[PDB]
Amino acid sequence: MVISWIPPYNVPVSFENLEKSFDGYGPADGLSHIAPQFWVPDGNGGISYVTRDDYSMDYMNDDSVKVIRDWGNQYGIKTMLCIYNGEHGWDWSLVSTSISAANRQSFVDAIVTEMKRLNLHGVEVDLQGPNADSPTDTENFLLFMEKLSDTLSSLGKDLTIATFASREWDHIPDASHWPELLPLVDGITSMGYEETGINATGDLSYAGQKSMAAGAPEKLMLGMPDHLDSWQGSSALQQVEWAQDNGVGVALWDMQLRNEAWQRRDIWKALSEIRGPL
Ligand SMILES: CC(=O)N[C@@H]1[C@@H](O)[C@H](O[C@@H]2O[C@H](CO)[C@@H](O[C@@H]3O[C@H](CO)[C@@H](O[C@@H]4O[C@H](CO)[C@@H](O[C@@H]5O[C@H](CO)[C@@H](O[C@@H]6O[C@H](CO)[C@@H](O)[C@H](O)[C@H]6NC(C)=O)[C@H](O)[C@H]5NC(C)=O)[C@H](O)[C@H]4NC(C)=O)[C@H](O)[C@H]3NC(C)=O)[C@H](O)[C@H]2NC(C)=O)[C@@H](CO)O[C@H]1O
Ligand code: NA
Protein backbone atom coordinates (compact mmCIF):
# COMPACT_ATOMS: atom_id res chain seq x y z
CA MET A 1 0.00 0.00 0.00
CA VAL A 2 1.09 3.62 -0.51
CA ILE A 3 -0.77 6.24 1.51
CA SER A 4 -0.53 9.97 2.13
CA TRP A 5 -2.47 12.42 4.25
CA ILE A 6 -4.02 15.85 3.81
CA PRO A 7 -3.74 17.73 7.14
CA PRO A 8 -6.53 20.17 8.03
CA TYR A 9 -4.33 23.28 7.57
CA ASN A 10 -2.71 24.59 4.37
CA VAL A 11 -5.32 22.58 2.45
CA PRO A 12 -5.13 24.63 -0.80
CA VAL A 13 -1.50 23.55 -1.18
CA SER A 14 -2.30 19.86 -0.63
CA PHE A 15 -5.20 20.02 -3.09
CA GLU A 16 -2.99 21.56 -5.77
CA ASN A 17 -0.40 18.83 -5.16
CA LEU A 18 -2.91 16.03 -5.78
CA GLU A 19 -3.08 16.99 -9.44
CA LYS A 20 0.64 17.59 -9.98
CA SER A 21 2.63 15.54 -12.47
CA PHE A 22 6.37 15.97 -12.03
CA ASP A 23 7.39 15.38 -15.63
CA GLY A 24 5.00 12.43 -15.91
CA TYR A 25 4.75 10.92 -12.41
CA GLY A 26 2.94 12.26 -9.39
CA PRO A 27 0.46 11.45 -6.64
CA ALA A 28 -2.12 9.97 -9.05
CA ASP A 29 0.50 7.39 -10.03
CA GLY A 30 2.08 6.79 -6.61
CA LEU A 31 -0.75 6.60 -4.06
CA SER A 32 -3.21 3.79 -3.50
CA HIS A 33 -4.87 5.65 -0.60
CA ILE A 34 -5.37 9.29 0.39
CA ALA A 35 -6.40 10.26 3.93
CA PRO A 36 -7.87 13.69 4.80
CA GLN A 37 -7.13 14.21 8.50
CA PHE A 38 -10.35 16.18 8.94
CA TRP A 39 -12.22 14.40 11.76
CA VAL A 40 -11.82 14.15 15.54
CA PRO A 41 -13.57 12.29 18.36
CA ASP A 42 -15.96 14.42 20.38
CA GLY A 43 -15.07 12.34 23.45
CA ASN A 44 -18.64 11.19 24.09
CA GLY A 45 -18.88 8.46 21.44
CA GLY A 46 -19.30 10.64 18.36
CA ILE A 47 -17.12 12.44 15.82
CA SER A 48 -16.80 15.94 14.39
CA TYR A 49 -15.03 17.78 11.65
CA VAL A 50 -12.10 19.92 12.74
CA THR A 51 -13.43 23.29 13.97
CA ARG A 52 -10.32 25.39 14.85
CA ASP A 53 -10.90 28.72 13.12
CA ASP A 54 -7.18 29.14 12.32
CA TYR A 55 -7.10 25.91 10.28
CA SER A 56 -8.50 25.60 6.72
CA MET A 57 -12.13 25.96 7.77
CA ASP A 58 -13.24 26.63 4.16
CA TYR A 59 -12.30 22.97 3.47
CA MET A 60 -13.74 21.21 6.55
CA ASN A 61 -16.90 20.20 4.74
CA ASP A 62 -18.54 17.50 2.66
CA ASP A 63 -17.95 19.22 -0.69
CA SER A 64 -14.20 19.40 -0.09
CA VAL A 65 -14.01 15.77 1.04
CA LYS A 66 -15.90 14.80 -2.13
CA VAL A 67 -13.34 16.72 -4.20
CA ILE A 68 -10.66 14.35 -2.83
CA ARG A 69 -12.90 11.30 -3.26
CA ASP A 70 -13.79 12.19 -6.86
CA TRP A 71 -10.14 12.91 -7.63
CA GLY A 72 -9.12 9.47 -6.43
CA ASN A 73 -12.02 7.67 -8.07
CA GLN A 74 -10.57 8.64 -11.48
CA TYR A 75 -7.59 6.39 -10.77
CA GLY A 76 -8.96 3.74 -8.41
CA ILE A 77 -7.36 5.50 -5.42
CA LYS A 78 -9.23 5.03 -2.14
CA THR A 79 -10.14 8.00 0.07
CA MET A 80 -9.98 7.14 3.76
CA LEU A 81 -11.77 8.91 6.59
CA CYS A 82 -8.83 9.84 8.85
CA ILE A 83 -9.82 10.42 12.47
CA TYR A 84 -7.18 11.94 14.74
CA ASN A 85 -6.92 13.39 18.22
CA GLY A 86 -4.41 16.18 17.65
CA GLU A 87 -6.59 19.22 16.88
CA HIS A 88 -5.38 21.06 20.02
CA GLY A 89 -2.35 18.88 20.64
CA TRP A 90 -2.33 15.14 21.16
CA ASP A 91 -5.17 14.49 23.60
CA TRP A 92 -5.50 10.84 24.59
CA SER A 93 -8.44 11.61 26.93
CA LEU A 94 -10.65 12.13 23.85
CA VAL A 95 -9.80 8.57 22.80
CA SER A 96 -9.96 6.92 26.23
CA THR A 97 -13.56 8.00 26.76
CA SER A 98 -14.47 7.03 23.17
CA ILE A 99 -13.16 3.45 23.53
CA SER A 100 -14.61 2.74 26.97
CA ALA A 101 -17.23 0.03 27.25
CA ALA A 102 -19.94 2.70 27.53
CA ASN A 103 -19.09 4.49 24.27
CA ARG A 104 -17.10 2.06 22.11
CA GLN A 105 -19.96 0.76 19.97
CA SER A 106 -21.32 4.29 19.49
CA PHE A 107 -17.85 5.44 18.42
CA VAL A 108 -17.46 2.69 15.81
CA ASP A 109 -20.99 3.41 14.58
CA ALA A 110 -20.28 7.14 14.27
CA ILE A 111 -17.07 6.57 12.31
CA VAL A 112 -18.65 4.06 9.92
CA THR A 113 -21.80 6.17 9.49
CA GLU A 114 -19.68 9.15 8.41
CA MET A 115 -17.56 7.09 6.00
CA LYS A 116 -20.69 5.67 4.37
CA ARG A 117 -22.40 9.08 4.25
CA LEU A 118 -19.61 10.42 2.03
CA ASN A 119 -19.11 7.21 -0.01
CA LEU A 120 -15.53 6.81 1.24
CA HIS A 121 -13.47 3.65 0.93
CA GLY A 122 -12.34 3.00 4.49
CA VAL A 123 -10.95 4.47 7.68
CA GLU A 124 -7.41 5.57 8.61
CA VAL A 125 -7.16 5.55 12.41
CA ASP A 126 -4.70 8.20 13.62
CA LEU A 127 -5.45 8.20 17.35
CA GLN A 128 -2.21 8.82 19.25
CA GLY A 129 -1.40 8.37 22.92
CA PRO A 130 2.22 9.40 23.50
CA ASN A 131 3.39 7.71 26.71
CA ALA A 132 -0.27 6.86 27.42
CA ASP A 133 -0.41 3.07 27.30
CA SER A 134 -1.86 0.99 30.12
CA PRO A 135 -3.43 -2.48 30.38
CA THR A 136 -6.92 -0.96 30.21
CA ASP A 137 -6.06 1.30 27.28
CA THR A 138 -4.45 -1.59 25.36
CA GLU A 139 -7.47 -3.85 25.90
CA ASN A 140 -10.05 -1.19 25.07
CA PHE A 141 -8.19 0.12 22.02
CA LEU A 142 -7.81 -3.37 20.56
CA LEU A 143 -11.49 -4.14 21.22
CA PHE A 144 -12.30 -0.90 19.39
CA MET A 145 -10.07 -1.85 16.47
CA GLU A 146 -11.52 -5.37 16.27
CA LYS A 147 -15.11 -4.10 16.19
CA LEU A 148 -14.24 -1.46 13.59
CA SER A 149 -12.41 -4.13 11.57
CA ASP A 150 -15.32 -6.57 11.62
CA THR A 151 -17.76 -3.83 10.60
CA LEU A 152 -15.61 -2.53 7.76
CA SER A 153 -14.92 -6.08 6.56
CA SER A 154 -18.64 -6.76 6.18
CA LEU A 155 -18.85 -3.59 4.04
CA GLY A 156 -15.82 -4.44 1.89
CA LYS A 157 -14.00 -1.33 3.14
CA ASP A 158 -10.34 -0.82 4.07
CA LEU A 159 -8.91 -0.22 7.54
CA THR A 160 -5.49 1.29 8.20
CA ILE A 161 -3.92 2.46 11.45
CA ALA A 162 -1.00 4.76 12.23
CA THR A 163 1.24 3.85 15.16
CA PHE A 164 4.40 5.01 16.85
CA ALA A 165 7.42 3.27 15.31
CA SER A 166 9.08 2.00 18.52
CA ARG A 167 8.06 -0.74 20.91
CA GLU A 168 10.30 -0.13 23.92
CA TRP A 169 8.41 2.89 25.32
CA ASP A 170 4.91 3.32 26.76
CA HIS A 171 3.20 4.72 23.65
CA ILE A 172 -0.19 3.59 22.38
CA PRO A 173 -0.57 2.34 19.70
CA ASP A 174 3.03 1.37 18.95
CA ALA A 175 4.98 -1.47 17.36
CA SER A 176 4.39 -3.64 20.45
CA HIS A 177 0.75 -3.76 19.30
CA TRP A 178 1.50 -4.79 15.69
CA PRO A 179 1.06 -8.55 16.32
CA GLU A 180 -2.50 -7.89 17.49
CA LEU A 181 -3.27 -5.14 14.95
CA LEU A 182 -1.97 -6.83 11.78
CA PRO A 183 -4.76 -9.46 11.57
CA LEU A 184 -7.37 -6.70 11.89
CA VAL A 185 -6.13 -4.17 9.34
CA ASP A 186 -5.17 -3.82 5.71
CA GLY A 187 -2.19 -1.62 6.54
CA ILE A 188 -0.15 -0.18 9.39
CA THR A 189 1.66 3.12 8.94
CA SER A 190 4.71 3.22 11.17
CA MET A 191 5.12 6.91 12.06
CA GLY A 192 8.89 6.81 12.24
CA TYR A 193 9.70 9.63 9.80
CA GLU A 194 13.22 10.95 10.43
CA GLU A 195 13.78 8.45 13.27
CA THR A 196 13.55 5.37 11.00
CA GLY A 197 15.70 4.51 8.00
CA ILE A 198 17.97 1.98 6.35
CA ASN A 199 20.79 3.04 8.70
CA ALA A 200 18.85 3.71 11.90
CA THR A 201 19.49 1.66 15.04
CA GLY A 202 17.83 -1.57 16.07
CA ASP A 203 14.04 -1.62 15.98
CA LEU A 204 14.11 1.71 14.09
CA SER A 205 16.20 0.38 11.23
CA TYR A 206 14.00 -0.53 8.29
CA ALA A 207 15.11 -4.14 8.72
CA GLY A 208 13.96 -3.92 12.35
CA GLN A 209 10.66 -2.34 11.33
CA LYS A 210 9.97 -5.15 8.87
CA SER A 211 11.00 -7.73 11.49
CA MET A 212 8.44 -6.36 13.97
CA ALA A 213 5.80 -6.78 11.24
CA ALA A 214 6.89 -10.35 10.49
CA GLY A 215 3.33 -11.69 10.68
CA ALA A 216 2.40 -9.77 7.54
CA PRO A 217 5.17 -7.45 6.32
CA GLU A 218 3.27 -6.58 3.13
CA LYS A 219 0.86 -4.61 5.34
CA LEU A 220 3.61 -2.37 6.77
CA MET A 221 4.06 1.15 5.40
CA LEU A 222 7.24 2.98 6.40
CA GLY A 223 6.43 6.55 7.36
CA MET A 224 8.51 9.12 5.49
CA PRO A 225 8.53 12.92 5.85
CA ASP A 226 7.69 15.30 2.98
CA HIS A 227 9.75 18.18 4.41
CA LEU A 228 13.14 16.42 4.25
CA ASP A 229 15.30 15.29 1.34
CA SER A 230 17.25 12.84 3.50
CA TRP A 231 17.36 11.37 7.00
CA GLN A 232 19.37 8.73 8.86
CA GLY A 233 22.19 9.03 6.33
CA SER A 234 20.18 8.15 3.19
CA SER A 235 18.37 10.17 0.56
CA ALA A 236 14.60 10.16 0.46
CA LEU A 237 14.73 8.21 -2.80
CA GLN A 238 17.07 5.61 -1.26
CA GLN A 239 14.64 5.08 1.62
CA VAL A 240 11.80 4.52 -0.86
CA GLU A 241 14.03 2.15 -2.85
CA TRP A 242 14.60 0.07 0.28
CA ALA A 243 10.84 -0.36 0.65
CA GLN A 244 10.62 -1.34 -3.02
CA ASP A 245 13.37 -3.96 -2.67
CA ASN A 246 12.12 -5.40 0.62
CA GLY A 247 8.40 -5.89 0.05
CA VAL A 248 6.89 -3.17 2.23
CA GLY A 249 4.94 -0.01 1.49
CA VAL A 250 5.34 3.71 2.11
CA ALA A 251 3.33 6.30 4.03
CA LEU A 252 4.12 9.91 3.07
CA TRP A 253 3.37 12.49 5.77
CA ASP A 254 2.16 14.67 4.08
CA MET A 255 0.69 16.01 0.81
CA GLN A 256 2.11 19.50 1.34
CA LEU A 257 5.21 18.10 -0.47
CA ARG A 258 7.30 20.80 1.17
CA ASN A 259 10.77 19.60 0.10
CA GLU A 260 11.74 19.66 -3.56
CA ALA A 261 12.91 16.02 -3.29
CA TRP A 262 9.24 15.04 -3.05
CA GLN A 263 8.48 17.16 -6.15
CA ARG A 264 10.68 15.01 -8.39
CA ARG A 265 9.72 12.45 -10.98
CA ASP A 266 12.11 9.79 -9.69
CA ILE A 267 10.55 9.28 -6.27
CA TRP A 268 7.00 9.27 -7.67
CA LYS A 269 8.04 6.69 -10.27
CA ALA A 270 9.43 4.51 -7.49
CA LEU A 271 6.22 4.91 -5.46
CA SER A 272 4.17 4.04 -8.56
CA GLU A 273 6.18 0.83 -8.94
CA ILE A 274 5.72 -0.05 -5.26
CA ARG A 275 1.99 0.60 -5.60
CA GLY A 276 1.41 -1.25 -8.85
CA PRO A 277 -1.72 -0.90 -10.98
CA LEU A 278 -5.12 -0.34 -9.42
C1 LIG B 1 9.98 11.35 27.23
C2 LIG B 1 9.69 9.87 27.43
O1 LIG B 1 9.18 9.52 28.44
N1 LIG B 1 10.02 8.87 26.41
C3 LIG B 1 10.66 9.24 25.10
C4 LIG B 1 9.68 8.89 24.04
O2 LIG B 1 8.48 9.69 24.21
C5 LIG B 1 10.28 9.10 22.69
O3 LIG B 1 9.34 8.67 21.69
C6 LIG B 1 9.02 9.73 20.79
O4 LIG B 1 8.08 10.69 21.42
C7 LIG B 1 7.77 11.78 20.51
C8 LIG B 1 6.96 12.80 21.25
O5 LIG B 1 5.76 12.21 21.69
C9 LIG B 1 7.02 11.22 19.29
O6 LIG B 1 6.74 12.35 18.45
C10 LIG B 1 5.42 12.35 17.90
O7 LIG B 1 5.33 11.28 16.90
C11 LIG B 1 4.05 11.21 16.20
C12 LIG B 1 4.20 10.05 15.27
O8 LIG B 1 5.32 10.28 14.44
C13 LIG B 1 3.75 12.54 15.51
O9 LIG B 1 2.43 12.52 14.94
C14 LIG B 1 2.29 12.16 13.55
O10 LIG B 1 3.48 12.64 12.82
C15 LIG B 1 3.42 13.93 12.14
C16 LIG B 1 4.77 14.60 12.27
O11 LIG B 1 5.07 15.05 13.57
C17 LIG B 1 2.25 14.78 12.64
O12 LIG B 1 2.32 16.01 11.94
C18 LIG B 1 2.40 17.15 12.79
O13 LIG B 1 1.05 17.35 13.33
C19 LIG B 1 0.97 18.57 14.13
C20 LIG B 1 -0.41 18.65 14.74
O14 LIG B 1 -1.39 18.77 13.74
C21 LIG B 1 1.28 19.77 13.25
O15 LIG B 1 1.16 20.95 14.06
C22 LIG B 1 0.44 22.01 13.43
O16 LIG B 1 1.29 22.63 12.40
C23 LIG B 1 0.63 23.70 11.68
C24 LIG B 1 1.55 24.21 10.61
O17 LIG B 1 2.81 24.47 11.16
C25 LIG B 1 0.26 24.82 12.66
O18 LIG B 1 -0.41 25.84 11.92
C26 LIG B 1 -0.62 24.25 13.74
O19 LIG B 1 -0.90 25.27 14.76
C27 LIG B 1 0.00 23.08 14.41
N2 LIG B 1 -1.00 22.47 15.33
C28 LIG B 1 -0.63 21.92 16.61
C29 LIG B 1 -1.78 21.32 17.43
O20 LIG B 1 0.49 21.92 17.02
C30 LIG B 1 2.69 19.63 12.74
O21 LIG B 1 2.96 20.69 11.77
C31 LIG B 1 2.89 18.35 12.01
N3 LIG B 1 4.34 18.11 11.80
C32 LIG B 1 4.88 17.96 10.48
C33 LIG B 1 6.37 17.69 10.40
O22 LIG B 1 4.20 18.05 9.50
C34 LIG B 1 1.00 14.01 12.32
O23 LIG B 1 -0.22 14.74 12.66
C35 LIG B 1 0.95 12.73 13.10
N4 LIG B 1 0.16 11.73 12.32
C36 LIG B 1 0.69 10.98 11.19
C37 LIG B 1 -0.29 10.02 10.51
O24 LIG B 1 1.84 11.11 10.87
C38 LIG B 1 3.81 13.66 16.52
O25 LIG B 1 3.61 14.94 15.86
C39 LIG B 1 5.10 13.69 17.27
N5 LIG B 1 5.03 14.64 18.41
C40 LIG B 1 5.90 15.80 18.47
C41 LIG B 1 5.77 16.71 19.69
O26 LIG B 1 6.68 16.03 17.60
C42 LIG B 1 7.88 10.19 18.60
O27 LIG B 1 7.18 9.47 17.55
C43 LIG B 1 8.40 9.15 19.53
N6 LIG B 1 9.42 8.39 18.79
C44 LIG B 1 9.41 6.95 18.78
C45 LIG B 1 10.51 6.27 17.97
O28 LIG B 1 8.59 6.33 19.40
C46 LIG B 1 11.54 8.25 22.53
C47 LIG B 1 12.14 8.40 21.16
O29 LIG B 1 12.56 9.73 21.00
O30 LIG B 1 12.54 8.65 23.54
C48 LIG B 1 11.97 8.49 24.92
O31 LIG B 1 12.88 8.94 25.83
NA1 NA C 1 5.42 -0.56 24.18
Side-chain angles (χ1 to χ4, degrees), residues 67-182:
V67 167
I68 304 165
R69 178 202 74 185
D70 290 344
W71 170 81
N73 282 348
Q74 300 179 111
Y75 308 109
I77 295 170
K78 288 175 181 316
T79 295
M80 305 286 272
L81 191 164
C82 176
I83 184 167
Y84 86 136
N85 64 321
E87 186 172 9
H88 294 279
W90 298 101
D91 182 350
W92 185 253
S93 69
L94 285 172
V95 183
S96 165
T97 59
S98 299
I99 63 179
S100 67
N103 291 334
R104 190 154 66 236
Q105 183 66 63
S106 296
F107 188 50
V108 171
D109 291 345
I111 292 163
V112 174
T113 295
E114 179 77 352
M115 177 204 68
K116 292 173 90 173
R117 188 175 71 80
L118 295 165
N119 213 345
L120 304 184
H121 302 99
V123 177
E124 143 56 19
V125 175
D126 184 26
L127 299 174
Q128 304 182 11
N131 316 108
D133 203 4
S134 72
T136 297
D137 290 287
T138 283
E139 175 179 11
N140 289 359
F141 189 79
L142 285 171
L143 287 173
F144 159 67
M145 284 300 290
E146 183 184 328
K147 183 183 298 302
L148 182 58
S149 175
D150 290 342
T151 305
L152 293 172
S153 181
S154 66
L155 295 167
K157 297 292 166 182
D158 283 6
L159 178 56
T160 58
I161 182 169
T163 80
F164 296 91
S166 51
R167 53 176 172 182
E168 66 176 308
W169 313 111
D170 46 355
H171 296 319
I172 180 174
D174 77 2
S176 76
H177 301 101
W178 294 356
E180 293 71 51
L181 289 168
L182 284 164

Side-chain angles (χ1 to χ4, degrees), residues 5 7-10 37 52 54-55 82 84 86-90 124-131 161-171 174 189-196 204 209 223 225-227 251-254 256 258:
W5 290 263
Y9 41 82
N10 205 28
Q37 187 193 55
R52 278 188 73 144
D54 61 337
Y55 281 13
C82 176
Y84 86 136
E87 186 172 9
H88 294 279
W90 298 101
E124 143 56 19
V125 175
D126 184 26
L127 299 174
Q128 304 182 11
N131 316 108
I161 182 169
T163 80
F164 296 91
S166 51
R167 53 176 172 182
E168 66 176 308
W169 313 111
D170 46 355
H171 296 319
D174 77 2
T189 61
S190 184
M191 299 186 287
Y193 306 129
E194 69 273 15
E195 286 186 87
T196 54
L204 301 181
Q209 294 281 281
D226 73 291
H227 69 287
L252 175 60
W253 177 272
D254 61 30
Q256 297 172 97
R258 287 166 289 184

